[PDB]
Amino acid sequence: PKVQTDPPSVPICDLYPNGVFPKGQECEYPPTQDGRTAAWRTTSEEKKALDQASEEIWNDFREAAEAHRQVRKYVMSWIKPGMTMIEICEKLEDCSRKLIKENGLNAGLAFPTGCSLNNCAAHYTPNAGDTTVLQYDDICKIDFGTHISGRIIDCAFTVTFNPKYDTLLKAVKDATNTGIKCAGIDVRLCDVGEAIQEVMESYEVEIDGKTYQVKPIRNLNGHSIGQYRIHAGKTVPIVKGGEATRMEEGEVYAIETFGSTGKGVVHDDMECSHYMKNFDVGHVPIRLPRTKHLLNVINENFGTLAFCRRWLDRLGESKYLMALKNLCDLGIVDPYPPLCDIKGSYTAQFEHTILLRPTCKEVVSRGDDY
Numbered sequence: 001p002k003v004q005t006d007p008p009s010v011p012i013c014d015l016y017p018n019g020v021f022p023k024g025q026e027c028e029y030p031p032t033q034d035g036r037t038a039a040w041r042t043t044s045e046e047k048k049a050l051d052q053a054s055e056e057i058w059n060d061f062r063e064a065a066e067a068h069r070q071v072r073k074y075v076m077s078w079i080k081p082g083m084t085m086i087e088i089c090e091k092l093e094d095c096s097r098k099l100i101k102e103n104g105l106n107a108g109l110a111f112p113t114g115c116s117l118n119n120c121a122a123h124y125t126p127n128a129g130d131t132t133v134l135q136y137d138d139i140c141k142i143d144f145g146t147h148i149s150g151r152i153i154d155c156a157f158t159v160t161f162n163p164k165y166d167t168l169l170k171a172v173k174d175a176t177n178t179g180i181k182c183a184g185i186d187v188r189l190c191d192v193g194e195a196i197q198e199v200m201e202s203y204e205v206e207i208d209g210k211t212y213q214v215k216p217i218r219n220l221n222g223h224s225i226g227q228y229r230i231h232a233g234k235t236v237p238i239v240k241g242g243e244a245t246r247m248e249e250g251e252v253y254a255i256e257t258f259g260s261t262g263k264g265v266v267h268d269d270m271e272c273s274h275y276m277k278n279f280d281v282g283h284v285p286i287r288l289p290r291t292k293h294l295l296n297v298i299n300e301n302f303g304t305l306a307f308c309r310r311w312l313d314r315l316g317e318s319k320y321l322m323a324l325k326n327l328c329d330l331g332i333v334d335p336y337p338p339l340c341d342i343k344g345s346y347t348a349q350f351e352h353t354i355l356l357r358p359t360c361k362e363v364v365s366r367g368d369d370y
């Protein structure tokens with residue numbers, strides 16, 4: 001049989017010659033408010049047939065999830081202080097490309113590698129020239145995505161080296177798990193947020209002689225996922241007070257949670273690295289040549305998936321920042337700058353992708369690690 005190498009290099013598709021990829025964790029849905037269980041979905045005939053009818057879709061998520069598991073286990077084996085952020089992202093991405101068997105828009109990287117540090121929670125990846133080095137005391141959120149046929153896995157974990165952050169990571173992990181347990185068909189999104197927050201705030205942590213109650217970052221959220229659409233328009237709060245809109249059968253969610261020792265609110269900060277075409281904007285004729293060319297490059301290589309400046313650089317593009325600004329100003333592309341709490345704060349993140357299948361809830365990105 002074909003077996004994965006160390007370091008990993010064999011495409012997931014070659015490890016499963018039959019074309020059937022491993023299921024993630026399958027869960028009976030939670031009891032409804034009545035006390036009534038969801039054990040009926042497990043066998044039911046109409047649900048089973050409706051589930052089977054989307055089997056090729058779930059299978060594509062599963063392939064992408066297996067790639068995510070293998071990549072992240074590899075990353076955790078070598079990520080160390082002293083490495084530059086650029087070296088970390090490049091090493092990660094090279095492996096992800098190999099294991100997903102990158103093939104244009106058919107299979108690839110769904111969005112840039114997040115490696116946000118310390119008070120910064122999300123949407124940091126280095127641009128060219130960034131000399132930032134990972135430190136012993138750093139708290140680094142590794143957030144990367146894979147996709148097959150635009151079926152996206154968004155899954156993330158927090159890397160530390162100093163044990164002082166262990167309880168902060170435990171809090172956020174537990175909160176994410178709680179959100180995943182709460183989730184289900186017909187579950188109100190606001191209830192998921194309230195449940196996440198109750199858990200997260202049940203924790204207190206001590207870091208360098210100061211104590212904190214872990215705060216959810218109120219303006220960060222989980223999100224539904226659509227084909228080639230990382231944020232499909234439904235938001236999963238991580239605090240109380242959200243919308244009572246319900247989760248639906250067949251939806252896919254990224255259940256993310258973020259905890260902070262700061263304000264518990266992020267703002268835009270630092271140079272932008274992440275961008276993505278606006279999904280709702282259609283064809284716009286462009287005559288300006290550098291801007292036309294860049295848009296063509298984005299359409300060919302990314303479509304509606306997110307990208308970063310380093311990914312443009314790697315395609316041979318240079319001196320494109322004004323064209324990229326033009327596309328932003330035109331509303332064709334949106335910038336997604338780093339999102340950071342106050343200076344001196346610490347932030348942590350865990351995230352999984354879940355499939356609300358007719359027969360069960362599948363935590364498709366679950367591993368033995370988290």
Ligand SMILES: *C[C@]1(O)CC[C@@H](OC(=O)NC(C)C)c2nnn(Cc3ccc(OC)cc3)c21
Pocket residue numbers: 111112122123143154219220221222223230231256274275276306307336339351
């Ligand atoms: C998981 C995460 O990146 C962060 C949390 C959430 O974003 C917000 O809640 N933002 C508010 C409005 C400040 C979110 N929504 N989608 N993702 C995934 C994502 C989006 C874009 C991107 O590159 C452009 C990469 C990943 C998130």
Ligand SMILES: [Co+2]
Pocket residue numbers: 143144154155156256351
């Ligand atoms: Co993510």
Ligand SMILES: [Co+2]
Pocket residue numbers: 154222223254256351
């Ligand atoms: Co996400």
